[PDB]
């Protein structure tokens, strides 16, 4: 009685592929257009906000989560897989670093920690592997601003701009052409709305874009108005009005 | 369709797993048992099949006690029903120690419910194929409940299950209407016996031996006791008077 | 793979039936229990100049009063021996005396039941049942000389003589005619050699046969190569003078 | 492995067959629900029917009171509904000891979603079929409606519906809210809030329902209560007092 | 605090003879100056021509004996009603005694 | 198909129970004929012992569990042993904990539960063996029938093994007579041998196949084994 | 699936052409089904009629009708 | 119910017509339709209606009274020694069907054929049962 | 009717029967040939006599020998396996 | 739980998984041991086709199990490490506990025992390796040569050969050895071992690795230089018997 399932559910096929990773990727291709840009004077990430219903809050909805204070992530794939994964990433990041080295994990180090979760899950049976791909966009004061891709298997590679979801390749073409480093964060926000207007047609607004930047400070993001002791967050998610203001700014 | 006839660890499109369907079917393939709620109590009665004179009376009664005031009777297959009850008992002993009070009839419905439901989230455990009718009197009134094998259960005013389920609901539904709920507990033994008689008419390949028990707060004082002696004997006669044949 | 709890319409498990198939492929083991001893004999078989043929034998001692000869897979009979030694040693320490051959077979047969996926009755840790059957021979002071056939299925029967192996169908048939209730140890050993010669497609040497005996002034005793050969020497001449 | 619907693993397409079938035929159990927000209340109307005269309809429950203040409306069957209720209840209670505070709708929703997801990846469990709408009048947000659905997806609402008269309910509320420029109506007494609900209900599902065919659950600040049978008729007659 | 260990008195006497043997014991059971019993068999037949008395402290006697009574039963079942030898029984006790010393 | 629901012990089938379970009930008939009978003060068990050969020695079809209890098997041997040890364990504990012998009824209900557990477990199996368990407790004389799926019935008389229906016809006639003889062992015993030889129809009876066990009000678990069954034929 | 209303009308209609002792309470009959369309309802009618050929009559009681609808329900869905 | 119901048109059409035609004339009982098989197959709904094939009749297996009548029918046809007790033989056969009680009579005669008897005694029938009838045969007594 | 697995005594008879027609030179006991079969079917037996004859024809022979029969058992059974 | 089946019966009374284990050994390289009555010789292939191997860190085929005992193999290296490790531990376990140098028979029982376990026990498969175990018992000058299969069975052999073309090397060896007169001198027993292993390696005289074991820890691996010399000689012998 009870489970006995310990046989791996991810297995090799005659070609050298892994059935479960192939499947999972189809889901990711069909998922919501997300991109990431390093502006060099920041990092701007944008993703599609969506609504389920007009009578539905989209405050609760999670399309951009802060993994650690200076770092945000966005994705294309399977929403439920994303939500749990964010949780295990937040937990280990807090317990194992935030009073051990006395600060957040470096971006590359955090990409490896995610990578490991996904790989445990691919090796081991009882459970199928995560079906997701992430774009982890970040700042760490020992590597600047970074952009990574995290694949479903947990393969990762460095990027300085990319897009995943539906309609990626052409989105990368517009981004490649418009930005080539040394660019204001504001300007990268403008370029990003332009790339996505061409990418999404039928109805387009800044109330269907959810935009976050890592690329600012306020005293409010030290979390106190007194005498500094540390630097604190640089994650800031914008409200819908601010985004419409940048849509009005040519 | 398929995978849902061998498993329970995945969800049917019909919203109803084919293995679950087979579990209900074995319930209708047993004997009749019924349960009557009344204006102070509950009275339980069952048809016990007589096949041969090599069987002994009142040692193969299918009424089994849990605690002190809950009497539990079933239709379907014997081993499933006893294991289900043995688990009820163990939870009941635990209950009594910890909260220093007897186990409720609603509590017990939940206890059973969660053991069945557990085996219907897993393909690695096989669930129960009995419907168990139970009830009693407690600190918060009189209760009749019926547990079905999905892990569906509710409180009822009246219940039947088994081969003779239909005939029993007919004969019960007339008697309950006539009365406010089923009158007195005394009356309810006579009423019960009529219900068993009508339910026998779907068997007719075996003779039967009538067995009734009750739990009553006005004529037992809150304990589950069998109905035997004079009271059973007047009940056989009442049935045979009005129901002819 | 193949069910571990799935029976035939008769109600005899697949795994049990398959157990019976490996047994039938080993070399014969023949026991006759008499009133002065138990004789266990085996065909060891194979003779080659690139083979050390008198360094390998199929008659292994469990205890100073218990042997076993086997037939079937030999690798399997090593796990059976490891369990059996441990159980006998622990009982000699607790009560100072001999363990019963029937008792031993039941303790071993209990661990023959595990194979497959686990139970909630039992934790099934193995993958197949054992593919060897055994003739365990012994002495006890409370039933004297005895001979036992353990099947890996669970059944163990006491016998006065029984043969197992490939060539058992013939062998058993001979055992009955030769068997009587005034049979002795010395006659029984000579007779073993007769049976073994008959069924061989070779000349009987002690690098294809091994004898063993039980006397209660010495326990389980291996009839050595030197003695077994002297017995073979005596056979060949006497047979070859009845022709 | 196995297959994609004999055990829970990805489909060829990257879909999950089990979550989509969990959406469909768990709302067709003769259940239709809506929840709307008051000014200082939250109202739920949900269908709830009894097919016998011999089934006591009090025990029949599909609005549950999770705590003294928290309600959870289940769309889907009683075997599933009690697995989710046990979890909800436990979570509520645990929260109350550990964090010292009453359980918000949103936190409960989020926790249950993540848990269902884990059971979705498991190859020896199912996602529950149920759709769970968690209601109260929080003192940390006002009247609230948060709904989880079976895939591990969950999201907050201001007004929601389930069952295939979703479109009808939505459109009547949408037009209404666009005109009034608010998504909450203003009225103190619970009574007038239930009348507002009924108005949109009757139009939208195109029928009115009996006392024992309805079940209405009202959330108030620090209480959740269900309306008695007479109390649910009082309201249906009270609009007809106007007519 | 607590140590239940004391004494409960009584006296036993064993004599091996020519073909026979005795286990004589008084039937008085005490705890200090109070009378616990004035008859209580202080030699008891465990079966198999073995009679046994654990004099000293009662609380250990009762325990020692129960462990051993179930061993007499298990020896019979597992070895087809083959009766327990005085020497073998003595070894079986040794292991019991030795099993608690903590 | 057969092969579809057969592979593991965790599936029900439209029949109402699993195929494998029926195959366990079928095995009992293969194994040895054993009849069970009681009056009201004593209860008698009669069993035919079979071996394989001339030079084979019998396998015991009575296993004594206590000095007031024993049982007969019919069907698969290896499970009959695993069960008789469990019953030994159950018995002893009762005596150690509660000073209690272990009622036939009480034992049956524990044994049933063990049987459900091994039929919900997938690697697990039905035992494939039925047992007639006899006793005299302070509930009176008893015979119970145990089946390896958890079916437990209390009876006056019954049979498992070769032509059970065979013996059952005999017992059902002679019933009213022998059961009212209450206080004479020998008669009930004599009816047992008279019965068992008429079930037979492709076997014969003999002295050292037969073995009789009686338990009762004044008979502690006693076997008549070999020679001493002659005086009950 | 029918309404409760649909079943009633069809029971009343089928028993109108039929010969009967006693006024029939169609309303019970409807409860005793759960969604019988006209063909299923006809099997229930004839079923009652079978005990009436046996009871040597061309009429049927209320009593026949309750039993009849239930036996047809049980033998299928 | 698949898209191979396309190929299987000829069979949908023969059936449909025969039913359409029966309900056409349901009030009058002139013609009966009976279909027979070992076991129930997939079909179009038709078990729900009086005028179609309303009735769904099950065959169970025999019981002791039934086997015995079936044996008395058998024993008219062929010689016996007029001592043979159907009831007793019926206890001795487990889960036999009618056709199989008829094959025992043949085997009882094959014993008789070897023996040089022209009738059958009780023994002759007992031995007949032991031999195959090919679907069930009571002879079980092996296990060591 | 069975045509499945016969006995040792049985295998012997079917061997004896196919080799009557053949010339043979002495030293054959059927029992010995039978011994090497752990399980057979009737098909296998027919293959042992006929195969035993072939080893002789290659060497150019009319007679069959105990050696030949053994050689034919070893080949046939082993191929049947798997 | 992963104690469930992974090795099942054959209907023929073999085991599928043991039949498939033996195939991996055959595809493999060849190892041989030939006995004198003063030594036991072990030959092992090192047929480096490619010249881009650096061969002082390219794995060897000779392990110490003990200072007077060697193990050689033919089969997957990966599996063979796992067996080799358990066998070194067992030599030290005896040494520690019995205060006694190790006897060859018990070690062989040990090597047999782990492989035997993994066929019998569930959720494990047997190793892909057959071995030869040889050495000398303490205070003993007579040679010992054992063979173990991943079935778990075990035997002694006067000489045995394994891996690819086992038939060819047995068949040859059989004509050049008698138990009644086996070789006394190292040179001629080594000559025979190099000659058998020449005939299957093809070209090899640096690709053949000889290690000759004399009583109690005199274990010496002959070199390329020495081997090239015996091959020359063999080319002189084959035109003295023409």
UniProtKB/Swiss-Prot annotation, chain A:
Keyword Lyase on entry: no
A cellular-component GO term for this protein: nucleus
Subcellular location(s) of the protein: Cytoplasm; Nucleus
Family annotation (Gene3D superfamilies): Glutamine Phosphoribosylpyrophosphate, subunit 1, domain 1
Cross-link (Glycyl lysine isopeptide (Lys-Gly) (interchain with G-Cter in ubiquitin)): 108
Keyword Transferase: no
SMART domains in alphabetical order: Proteasome_A_N
Entries under InterPro entries matching the protein: Ntn_hydrolases_N (IPR029055), Proteasome_alpha (IPR050115), Proteasome_alpha-type (IPR023332), Proteasome_asu_N (IPR000426), Proteasome_sua/b (IPR001353)
GO BP annotation list: proteasomal ubiquitin-independent protein catabolic process; proteasome-mediated ubiquitin-dependent protein catabolic process
Any one Pfam family match given in the protein's UniProt record, by short name: Proteasome
Quaternary structure note: The 26S proteasome consists of a 20S proteasome core and two 19S regulatory subunits. The 20S proteasome core is composed of 28 subunits that are arranged in four stacked rings, resulting in a barrel-shaped structure. The two end rings are each formed by seven alpha subunits, and the two central rings are each formed by seven beta subunits. The catalytic chamber with the active sites is on the inside of the barrel.
Misc: Present with 7060 molecules/cell in log phase SD medium.
Protein name: Proteasome subunit alpha type-2
Source organism per UniProt: Saccharomyces cerevisiae (strain ATCC 204508 / S288c)
From Swiss-Prot, chain B:
UniProt PTM comment: The alpha and beta forms are probably products of the same gene with different post-translational modifications.
A GO CC term assigned to this protein in UniProt: proteasome storage granule
InterPro entries: Ntn_hydrolases_N, Proteasome_alpha, Proteasome_alpha-type, Proteasome_asu_N, Proteasome_sua/b
One MF term in the entry's GO annotations: mRNA binding
GO BP terms in the entry: proteasomal ubiquitin-independent protein catabolic process; proteasome-mediated ubiquitin-dependent protein catabolic process
Gene3D superfamilies referenced in this protein's UniProt entry, alphabetically: Glutamine Phosphoribosylpyrophosphate, subunit 1, domain 1
SUPFAM superfamilies: N-terminal nucleophile aminohydrolases (Ntn hydrolases)
Keywords attached to this entry: Acetylation, Cytoplasm, Nucleus, Proteasome
Keyword check for Nucleus: yes
The keyword Phosphoprotein is assigned to this record: no
Function of the molecule: The proteasome degrades poly-ubiquitinated proteins in the cytoplasm and in the nucleus. It is essential for the regulated turnover of proteins and for the removal of misfolded proteins. The proteasome is a multicatalytic proteinase complex that is characterized by its ability to cleave peptides with Arg, Phe, Tyr, Leu, and Glu adjacent to the leaving group at neutral or slightly basic pH. It has an ATP-dependent proteolytic activity.
More info: Present with 12000 molecules/cell in log phase SD medium.
Protein name: Probable proteasome subunit alpha type-7
Lineage: Eukaryota, Fungi, Dikarya, Ascomycota, Saccharomycotina
Curated annotation (Swiss-Prot), chain I:
Domain of life assignment: Eukaryota
Annotated signal peptide: none
Coiled coil ranges: none
Subcellular location, record wording: Cytoplasm; Nucleus
PTM statement from Swiss-Prot or TrEMBL: The N-terminus is blocked.
Quaternary structure and interacting proteins, as annotated: Interacts with UBR1 and CIC1.
Other facts: Present with 105 molecules/cell in log phase SD medium.
Function: The 26S proteasome is involved in the ATP-dependent degradation of ubiquitinated proteins. The regulatory (or ATPase) complex confers ATP dependency and substrate specificity to the 26S complex.
Family: Belongs to the AAA ATPase family.
Protein name: 26S proteasome regulatory subunit 7 homolog
Gene name as annotated: RPT1
UniProtKB/Swiss-Prot annotation, chain J:
Gene3D superfamilies (UniProt xref): Glutamine Phosphoribosylpyrophosphate, subunit 1, domain 1
An annotated GO cellular component: nuclear outer membrane-endoplasmic reticulum membrane network
Residue stretches of biased makeup (Basic and acidic residues): 235-242
Transmembrane portions of the chain: none
Record localization: Cytoplasm; Nucleus
InterPro entries, sorted: Ntn_hydrolases_N, Proteasome_alpha, Proteasome_alpha-type, Proteasome_asu_N, Proteasome_bsu_CS, Proteasome_sua/b
Domain of life of the source: Eukaryota
Keyword Nucleus: yes
PROSITE patterns hit by this protein: PROTEASOME_ALPHA_1 (PS00388), PROTEASOME_ALPHA_2 (PS51475)
Residues with PTM Phosphothreonine: 58
Subunit structure: The 26S proteasome consists of a 20S proteasome core and two 19S regulatory subunits. The 20S proteasome core is composed of 28 subunits that are arranged in four stacked rings, resulting in a barrel-shaped structure. The two end rings are each formed by seven alpha subunits, and the two central rings are each formed by seven beta subunits. The catalytic chamber with the active sites is on the inside of the barrel. Interacts with CIC1.
Misc note: Present with 16800 molecules/cell in log phase SD medium.
Protein name: Proteasome subunit alpha type-4
Gene name tied to this protein: PRE6
């Amino acid at each position: 009685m009870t489970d006995r399932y310990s046989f791996s559910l991810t297995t090799f096929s005659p070609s050298g592929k892994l059935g479960q990773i192939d499947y999972a990727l189809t889901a990711v291709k069909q998922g919501v257009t997300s991109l990431g840009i390093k502006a060099t004077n920041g990092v701007v990430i944008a993703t599609e906000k969506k609504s389920s219903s007009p009578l539905a809050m989209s405050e609760t909805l999670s399309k951009v989560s802060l993994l650690t204070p200076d770092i945000g992530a966005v994705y294309s794939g399977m929403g439920p897989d994303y939500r749990v994964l964010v949780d295990k990433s937040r937990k280990v990041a807090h317990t194992s670093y935030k009073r051990i080295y006395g600060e957040y994990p470096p971006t590359k180090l955090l990409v490896s920690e995610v990578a490991k979760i996904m790989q445990e899950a691919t090796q081991s049976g009882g459970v199928r592997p995560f079906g997701v791909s992430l774009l982890i966009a970040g700042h760490d004061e020992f590597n600047g601003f970074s952009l990574y891709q995290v694949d479903p298997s947990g393969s990762y590679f460095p990027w300085k701009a990319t897009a995943i979801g539906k309609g990626s390749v052409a989105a990368k073409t517009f981004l490649e052409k418009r930005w080539n480093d040394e660019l204001e964060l504001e300007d990268a926000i403008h370029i990003a709305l332009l790339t996505l207007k061409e990418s999404v047609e039928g109805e387009f607004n800044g109330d269907t874009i959810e935009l976050a930047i890592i690329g600012d400070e306020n005293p409010d993001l030290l979390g106190y108005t007194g005498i500094p002791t540390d630097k604190g967050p640089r994650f800031r998610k914008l409200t819908s009005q601010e985004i419409n203001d940048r849509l009005e700014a040519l | 369709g398929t995978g849902y006839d061998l498993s329970n660890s995945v969800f049917s499109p019909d919203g109803r797993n084919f293995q679950v369907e087979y579990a209900v079917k074995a319930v209708e393939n047993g004997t009749t048992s019924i349960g009557i709620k009344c204006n102070d109590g509950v009275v339980f009665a069952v048809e016990k099949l007589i096949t041969s004179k090599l069987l002994v009376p009142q040692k193969n009664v299918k009424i089994q006690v849990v605690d002190r005031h809950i009497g539990c009777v079933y239709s379907g297959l014997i081993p499933d029903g006893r294991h289900l009850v043995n688990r009820g008992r163990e939870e009941a002993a635990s209950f009594k120690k910890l909260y220093k009070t007897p186990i409720p009839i609603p509590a017990f419905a939940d206890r059973l419910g969660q053991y069945v439901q557990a085996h219907t989230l897993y393909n690695s455990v096989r669930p129960f194929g009995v419907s168990t009718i139970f009830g009693g009197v407690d600190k918060n009134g009189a209760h009749l409940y019926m547990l079905e094998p999905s892990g569906s259960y509710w409180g009822y005013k009246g219940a039947a299950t088994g081969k003779g389920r239909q005939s029993a609901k007919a004969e019960l539904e007339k008697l309950v209407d006539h009365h406010p709920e089923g009158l007195s507990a005394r009356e309810a033994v006579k009423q019960a016996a009529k219900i068993i008689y009508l339910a026998h008419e779907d068997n007719k390949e075996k003779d039967f031996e009538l067995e009734i028990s009750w739990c009553s707060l006005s004529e037992t004082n809150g304990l589950h006791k069998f109905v035997k002696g004079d009271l059973l004997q007047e009940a056989i006669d009442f049935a045979q008077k009005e129901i002819n044949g | 793979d193949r069910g571990v709890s799935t029976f035939s319409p008769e109600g005899r498990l697949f795994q049990v039936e398959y157990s019976l198939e490996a047994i039938k492929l080993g070399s014969t083991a023949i026991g006759i229990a008499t009133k002065e001893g138990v004789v266990l004999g085996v065909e060891k078989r194979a003779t080659s100049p690139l083979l050390e043929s008198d360094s390998i034998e199929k008659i292994v001692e469990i205890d100073r009063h218990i042997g076993c000869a086997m037939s079937g897979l030999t690798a399997d009979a090593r796990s059976m021996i490891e369990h059996a030694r441990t159980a006998a040693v622990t009982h000699n320490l607790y009560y100072d005396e001999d363990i019963n051959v029937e008792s031993l077979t039941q303790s071993v047969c209990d661990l023959a039941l595990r194979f497959g996926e686990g139970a909630s009755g039992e934790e099934r840790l193995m993958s197949r049942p054992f593919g060897v059957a055994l003739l365990i021979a012994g002495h006890d002071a409370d039933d004297g000389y005895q001979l036992f056939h353990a099947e890996p299925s669970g059944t163990f029967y006491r016998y006065n003589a029984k043969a197992i192996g490939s060539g058992s169908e013939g062998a058993q048939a001979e055992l009955l005619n030769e068997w009587h209730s005034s049979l002795t140890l010395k006659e029984a050993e000579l007779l073993v050699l007769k049976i073994l010669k008959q069924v061989m497609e070779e000349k009987l040497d002690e690098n294809n046969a091994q004898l063993s005996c039980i006397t209660k002034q010495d326990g389980f005793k291996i009839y050595d190569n030197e003695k077994t050969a002297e017995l073979i020497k005596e056979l060949k001449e006497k047979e070859a003078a009845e022709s | 492995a196995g297959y994609d619907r004999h055990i829970t693993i990805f489909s060829p397409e990257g879909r999950l067959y089990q979550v989509e079938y969990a959406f469909k035929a768990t709302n067709q159990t003769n259940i239709n629900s809506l929840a709307v927000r008051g000014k200082d209340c939250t109202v739920v109307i949900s269908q709830k029917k009894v097919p016998d005269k011999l089934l006591d309809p009090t025990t029949v429950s599909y609005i549950f009171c999770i705590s003294r203040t928290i309600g959870m409306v289940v769309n889907g069957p009683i075997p599933d509904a009690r697995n989710a209720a046990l979890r909800a209840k436990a979570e509520a209670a645990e929260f109350r000891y550990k964090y010292g505070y009453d359980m918000p709708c949103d936190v409960l929703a989020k926790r249950m979603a993540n848990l269902s997801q884990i059971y979705t990846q498991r190859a020896y469990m199912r996602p529950l079929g149920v759709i769970l709408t968690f209601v109260s009048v929080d003192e940390e947000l006002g009247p609230s409606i948060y709904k989880t659905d079976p895939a591990g997806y969950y999201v907050g609402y201001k007004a929601t519906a389930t069952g295939p008269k979703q479109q009808e309910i939505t459109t009547n509320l949408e037009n209404h809210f666009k005109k009034s420029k608010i998504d909450h109506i203003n009225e103190e007494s619970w009574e007038k809030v239930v009348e507002f609900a009924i108005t949109h209900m009757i139009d939208a599902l195109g029928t009115e329902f009996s006392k024992n065919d309805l079940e209405v659950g009202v959330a108030t600040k620090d209480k959740f209560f269900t309306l008695s049978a007479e109390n649910i008729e009082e309201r249906l007659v009270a609009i007809a007092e106007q007519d | 605090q607590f140590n239940p260990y004391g004494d409960n008195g009584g006296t036993i006497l064993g004599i091996a003879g020519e073909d026979f043997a005795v286990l004589a014991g008084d039937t008085r059971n005490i705890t200090d100056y109070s009378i616990n019993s004035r008859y209580e068999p202080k030699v008891f037949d465990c079966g198999d021509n073995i009679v046994m008395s654990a004099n000293g402290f009662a609380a250990d006697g009762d325990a020692l004996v129960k462990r051993f009574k179930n061993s007499v039963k298990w020896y019979h079942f597992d070895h087809n009603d083959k009766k327990l030898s005085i020497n073998s029984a003595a070894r079986n006790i040794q292991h019991l005694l030795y099993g608690k010393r903590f | 198909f057969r092969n579809n629901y057969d592979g593991d012990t965790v599936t029900f089938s439209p029949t109402g129970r699993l195929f494998q379970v029926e195959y366990a009930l079928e095995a009992i008939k293969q194994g040895s004929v054993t009849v069970g009978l009681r009056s009201n003060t004593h209860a008698v068990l009669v069993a035919l012992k079979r071996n394989a050969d001339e030079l084979s020695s019998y396998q015991k079809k009575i296993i004594k569990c206590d000095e007031h209890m024993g049982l007969s098997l019919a069907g698969l041997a290896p499970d009959a042993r695993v069960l008789s040890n469990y019953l030994r364990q159950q018995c002893n504990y009762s005596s150690l904990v509660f000073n209690r012998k272990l009622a036939v009824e009480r034992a049956g209900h524990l044994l049933c539960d063990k049987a459900q557990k091994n039929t919900q477990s997938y690697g697990g199996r039905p035992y494939g063996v039925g047992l007639l368990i006899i006793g005299y407790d302070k509930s009176g004389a008893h015979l119970l029938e145990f089946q390896p799926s958890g079916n437990v019935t209390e009876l006056y008389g019954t049979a498992i093994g070769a032509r059970s229906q065979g013996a059952k016809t005999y017992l059902e006639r002679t019933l009213d007579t022998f059961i009212k003889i209450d206080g004479n062992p020998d008669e009930l015993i004599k009816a047992g041998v008279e019965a068992i030889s008429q079930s037979l129809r492709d076997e014969s009876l003999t002295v050292d196949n037969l073995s009789i066990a009686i338990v009762g009000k004044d008979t502690p678990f006693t076997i008549y084994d070999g020679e001493a069954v002659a005086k009950y034929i | 699936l029918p309404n409760e209303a649909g079943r009633l009308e069809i029971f009343k209609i089928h028993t109108a052409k039929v010969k009967k002792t006693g006024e029939f309470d169609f309303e019970a009959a409807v409860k005793m089904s759960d969604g019988f369309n006209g063909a299923d309802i006809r099997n229930c009618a004839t079923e009652a009629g079978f005990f009436a050929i046996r009871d040597d009559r061309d009429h049927i009681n209320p009593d026949d009708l309750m039993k009849a609808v239930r036996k047809v329900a049980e033998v299928k869905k | 119910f698949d898209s191979e119901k396309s190929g299987d048109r000829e069979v949908q059409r023969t059936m449909l017509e025969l039913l359409n035609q029966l309900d056409g004339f349901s009030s009058d009982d002139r013609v009966k339709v009976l279909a027979a098989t070992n076991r129930v197959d997939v079909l179009d709904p038709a078990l729900l209606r009086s005028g179609r094939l309303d009735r769904k009749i099950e065959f169970p297996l025999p019981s002791e009274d039934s086997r015995a009548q079936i044996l008395q029918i058998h024993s008219r046809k062929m010689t016996t020694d007029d001592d043979i007790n159907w009831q007793e033989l019926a206890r001795s056969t487990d889960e036999f069907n009618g056709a199989q009680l008829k094959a025992v009579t043949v085997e009882a005669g094959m014993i008789a054929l070897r023996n040089g008897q022209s009738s059958v005694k009780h023994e002759d029938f007992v031995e007949g049962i032991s031999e195959v009838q090919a679907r069930k045969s009571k002879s079980v007594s092996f296990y060591a | 009717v069975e045509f499945s697995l016969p006995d040792l005594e049985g295998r012997a008879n079917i061997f004896r029967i196919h080799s009557k027609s053949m010339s043979v030179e002495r030293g054959i006991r059927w029992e010995l040939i039978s011994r090497l079969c752990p399980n057979s079917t009737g098909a296998e037996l027919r293959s042992v006599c006929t195969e035993a004859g072939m080893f002789a024809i290659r060497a150019r022979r009319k007679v069959a020998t105990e050696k030949d029969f053994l050689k034919a058992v070893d080949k046939v059974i082993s191929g049947y396996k798997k | 739980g992963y104690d469930r089946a992974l090795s099942i019966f054959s209907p023929d009374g073999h085991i599928f998984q043991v039949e498939y284990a033996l195939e991996a050994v055959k595809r493999g390289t060849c190892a041989v041991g030939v006995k004198g009555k003063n030594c036991v010789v072990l030959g092992c292939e090192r047929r480096s086709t490619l010249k881009l191997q650096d061969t002082r860190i390219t794995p060897s085929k000779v392990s110490k199990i003990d200072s007077h005992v060697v193990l050689s193999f033919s089969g997957l290296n990966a599996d063979s490490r796992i067996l080799i490790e358990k066998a070194r531990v067992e030599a030290q376990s005896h040494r520690l506990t019995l205060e006694d140098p190790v006897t060859v028979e018990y070690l062989t029982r040990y090597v047999a025992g782990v492989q035997q376990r993994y066929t019998q026990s569930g959720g494990v498969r047997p190793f892909g390796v057959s071995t030869l175990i040889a050495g000398f018992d303490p205070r003993d000058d007579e040679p010992k040569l054992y063979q173990t299969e991943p079935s778990g069975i075990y035997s002694s052999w006067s000489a045995q050969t394994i891996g690819r073309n086992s038939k060819t090397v047995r068949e040859f060896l059989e004509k050049n050895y008698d138990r009644k007169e086996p070789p006394a001198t190292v040179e001629e027993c080594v000559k025979l071992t190099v000659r058998s292993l020449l005939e299957v390696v093809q070209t090899g005289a640096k690709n053949i690795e000889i290690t000759v074991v004399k009583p109690d820890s005199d274990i010496v691996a002959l070199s390329s230089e020495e081997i090239n010399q015996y091959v020359t000689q063999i080319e002189q012998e084959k035109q003295e018997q023409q």
